[PDB]
Amino acid sequence: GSSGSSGVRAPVTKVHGGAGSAQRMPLCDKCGSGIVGAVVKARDKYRHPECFVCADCNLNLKQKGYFFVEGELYCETHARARTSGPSSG
Ligand SMILES: [Zn+2]
Ligand SMILES: [Zn+2]
Structure with a gap:
């Protein structure tokens, strides 16, 4: 018998910012x-009208329900599996 106990919590933070020169246009990630001419931005990121697709099946999420799992995108099918049982937010 061990009868031990553990506990760890490591939060995360994001940062975005850039100064210099540009054509005032988003860069397809x-x-x-x-x-x-035409772009497709979900939350904060931007993606072309044709590039917008899943990362596992490459399915056009544009019309479908896009998802955000660990920064990467995914379709309702795959995504659901990743974010399966999300927390109350
Ligand atoms: Zn593109
Ligand atoms: Zn997929």
Whole structure:
């Protein structure tokens, strides 16, 4: 018998900011290619109208319900598996 106890908690933080020069346009995090004309931004990130897809099946989430798991995107199917049973927020 061990009858021991443990406990650990490591929070996380994010930061975004950049100064210099640019064409005032979002950079597709998918093909890293300047976006001009038509873009698709879910929450804070931006993705082309064609690049927007799952990371496992590459399914166009544009029309479908996009998801955010660990920064990466996913379809209702895959995503659901990842965020399966989310916490009360
Ligand atoms: Zn793109
Ligand atoms: Zn998928």
